[PDB]
């Protein structure tokens, strides 16, 4: 079942060289969607395209408190309403590397380093989810 909100395990948690791939289609009336890599009560990595803001927000939530957002992009907004997408998240020792449709869009330095405990993937929001690899 690929209904959203979608949850699944990341076997063995995160470690350097582990890849997560999220494929789907942005809804034509989308406001936002989110991909969360969760550990317990924290969100290690929140990847959050916002179509009203024309932004891709990255952040971390610890004990229910959000940190400072990261929003830098090398070019234009890499998701579009109604458009198919493939998100590739690569875990390294110091950061996540994120590509969309093969285009590198950002690095995000780890704020939570307990990588094996980051063992739940959540995908939620205004998309049709078509494939997950964890």
Residue numbers in the entry: 12 to 145
Show passages lifted from the paper:
Ligand-free full-length rGal-5 crystallizes in the monoclinic P21 space group and diffracts to a resolution of 1.7 Å. The core of the different protein units can readily be superimposed onto each other, as revealed by the low average root mean square deviation (RMSD) value among them of 0.26 Å for all Cα atoms. Differences are attributed mainly to the N-terminus, and the six protein monomers can be divided into two groups, based on the experimental electron density. In the first group (chains A–C), the 11 residues at the N-terminus are not visible in the electron density map. When inspecting the second group (chains D–F), the electron density for this peptide stretch was clearly observed: the three amino acids from Ser2 to Ser5 form an extra β-strand, named F0, running in antiparallel direction to the C-terminal F1 strand. Residues Thr6 to Asn12 are in a loop, placed in parallel to the axis of the β-sandwich and protruding more than 10 Å from the S1 and F0 strands. The conformation within this loop is stabilized by interactions with symmetry-related molecules: hydrogen bonds between Pro9–His142, Tyr10–Glu103 and Asn12–Gly52 as well as a water bridge between Asn12 and Asn74. In the ligand-free structure, a network of water molecules or the presence of a single glycerol molecule takes the place of the core of a cognate glycan in the preformed contact site. As observed in the hGal-9N structure, a short β-strand is formed in the ligand-free rGal-5.
